C-alpha cells in the first residue's frame, strides 16, 4: 500500500492510472474489501482529483470505480467520499462521460443516495435529477439498469420524504421503465413508484396522470414475486386515495388480480392483497359491490379465520369496511353473514389489538343494526351469541380504552 499511495501521488500519468487500477482491484476483491486502510492512506481526495474535467477518461473511470466501492461500505466510509466533495463531480461525469464512465458515476451516486435521507437529499440539491433522467435515452441496458436502481434510491425513504417537486419529475420516465424487458430494471422501477405513490392524494394523482396504474395491475401477474411485491405495494398505495382515484385502479381490473394474489405462497403478498382490498371496500357502495362481484369475500373470510395475525388484521379491515355498505345496501350484510364472517370476526376479539378490536366491533354492530332493521320489516344477534361473540363483546367492556368500552357497552345494551 505505501508504494501504491506514492505511485498514486505521482505526476507521471501512466503511473497514476496504474496505481488507481491497483486501488480499484483491491477495493474490488471478492471478499473483505480493505476500505478503511485505503481511507487511512489518505488517497480519497486524490482519487476525486482524477474525476475532474480534463482527466483521461480511463483515469476517471478507474477513480470513479474505486470511489464507488468505498461508498458501498459503512455510513462512515460513505461520509469520507461525500466530505471529499465527490458528488458534484459524479454528476458532472453524467454530462461529459462515456456510457462506461456514466454508469460508474450513477452507480456511485446510488451508493451515496442509498446511505441515508441526508445524502439522498444532498444528491438531489446538487441538482442530480436532470442529468440522471437524461441517461434513460441510452441504448445501453446496463446503464439504464444501474440508473434505475440509483433513481429508486432517490425516491426512497420517509421521515423526511424526498422533495416531491424534484422526484416527481421522474414519473414520465418511470412510466416507460415498467414496460422494460429487463427484470432488474422492472423491479427497481416498481419500487421507485411504490415510494412515490406513498404520500398525499396529490402524489397519487401524479402517478395516475402519467397513466402508471394500468401497467401496475398488469405486472401483478408477472411470474416473479420480486416484481409483484413492489407493484402490489404501489397499487395498494394508490387506493388509499379518494373514491375517484380508487376507481381508476378498479377500472384497470385490479380485483381479479387481487383474487389470484390471495393464494400466493408469500404470506406478505396475501397480507398486502387483503390490505389493498380493504382500502377498496373503504370506498362507496358500488366499489364494495365490485369487490363482492369479484368473488373476493370467501377467500377473505378463510384468511380471517386461519391466516397469520398480520394477515388476519387486513382481512378484518376488508370485511369490516364492506359491512359499512350495509346501512345503504342491506344485501351486502346478508351476503357477508351468509359467507360465515361472524365467527371469525368474533374469535378475533380475544387476541386482537385495540385498533382491530374497534374495527371488529364496528363490523359486528353494522351486522347487528342490519339484523335489527331486518326485524321491523335478531338473526344476526343469535348468530353472534352462538359464535361465542356475545361473550367476547361483553368482555370488551373490561378494556382499559374508553372508546372500546363505550362501543361494547352500547352494543350489549342495544342488541343483547
Amino acid at each position: 500500500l505505501p508504494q501504491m499511495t506514492q505511485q498514486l501521488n505521482s505526476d507521471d500519468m501512466q503511473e497514476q492510472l496504474s496505481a488507481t487500477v491497483k486501488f480499484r482491484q483491491i477495493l474490488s476483491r471478492e471478499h473483505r474489501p480493505p476500505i478503511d486502510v485505503v481511507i487511512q492512506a489518505g488517497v480519497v481526495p486524490r482519487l476525486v482529483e482524477f474525476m475532474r474535467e480534463n482527466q483521461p477518461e480511463m483515469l476517471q473511470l478507474e477513480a470513479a470505480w474505486a470511489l464507488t466501492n468505498i461508498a458501498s461500505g459503512t455510513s462512515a466510509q460513505t461520509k469520507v467520499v461525500v466530505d471529499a466533495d465527490a458528488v458534484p463531480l459524479f454528476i458532472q461525469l453524467l454530462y461529459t462521460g462515456s456510457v462506461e464512465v456514466k454508469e460508474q458515476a450513477i452507480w456511485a451516486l446510488g451508493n451515496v443516495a442509498g446511505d441515508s435521507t441526508d445524502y439522498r437529499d444532498y444528491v438531489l440539491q446538487c441538482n442530480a435529477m436532470e442529468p440522471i433522467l437524461g441517461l434513460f435515452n441510452s441504448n445501453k441496458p446496463s446503464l439504464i439498469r444501474t440508473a434505475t436502481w440509483t433513481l429508486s434510491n432517490l425516491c426512497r425513504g420517509k421521515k423526511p420524504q424526498p422533495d416531491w417537486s424534484v422526484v416527481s419529475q421522474a414519473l414520465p420516465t418511470l412510466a416507460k421503465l415498467i414496460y422494460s424487458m429487463d427484470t432488474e430494471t422492472l423491479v427497481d422501477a416498481c419500487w421507485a413508484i411504490s415510494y412515490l405513490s406513498d404520500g398525499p392524494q396529490e402524489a397519487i394523482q401524479a402517478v395516475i396522470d402519467v397513466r402508471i396504474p394500468k401497467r401496475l395491475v398488469e405486472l401483478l401477474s408477472h411470474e416473479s414475486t420480486l416484481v409483484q411485491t413492489p407493484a402490489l405495494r404501489a397499487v395498494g398505495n394508490i387506493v388509499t386515495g379518494n373514491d375517484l382515484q380508487t376507481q381508476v385502479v378498479i377500472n384497470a381490473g385490479v380485483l381479479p388480480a387481487l383474487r389470484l394474489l390471495l393464494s400466493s405462497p408469500k404470506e406478505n403478498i396475501k397480507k398486502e392483497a387483503c390490505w389493498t382490498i380493504s382500502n377498496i371496500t373503504a370506498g362507496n357502495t358500488e366499489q364494495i359491490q365490485a369487490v363482492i362481484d369479484a368473488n373476493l369475500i370467501p377467500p377473505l373470510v378463510k384468511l380471517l379465520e386461519v391466516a397469520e395475525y398480520k394477515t388476519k388484521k387486513e382481512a378484518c379491515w376488508a370485511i369490516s369496511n364492506a359491512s359499512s355498505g350495509g346501512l345503504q345496501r342491506p344485501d351486502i350484510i346478508r351476503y357477508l353473514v351468509s359467507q360465515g364472517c361472524i365467527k371469525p370476526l368474533c374469535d378475533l376479539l380475544e387476541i386482537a389489538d385495540n385498533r382491530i378490536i374497534e374495527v371488529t366491533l364496528d363490523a359486528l354492530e353494522n351486522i347487528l343494526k342490519m339484523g335489527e332493521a331486518d326485524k321491523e320489516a335478531n338473526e344476526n344477534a343469535d348468530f353472534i351469541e352462538k359464535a361465542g361473540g356475545m361473550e367476547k363483546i361483553f368482555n370488551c367492556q373490561q378494556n382499559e380504552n374508553d372508546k372500546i368500552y363505550e362501543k361494547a357497552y352500547k352494543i350489549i345494551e342495544t342488541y343483547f
Binding site: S28, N69, G110, G114, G157, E272, A282, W317
Partner: peptide
C-alpha cells in the same frame, strides 16, 4: 375509512465486484 398497515432506512448499497 382508509388505512396504512414503519420508517426504516436500511442501507441500499451495491459494490462492483
Amino acid at each position: 375509512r382508509k388505512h396504512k398497515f414503519s420508517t426504516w432506512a436500511l442501507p441500499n448499497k451495491r459494490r462492483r465486484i
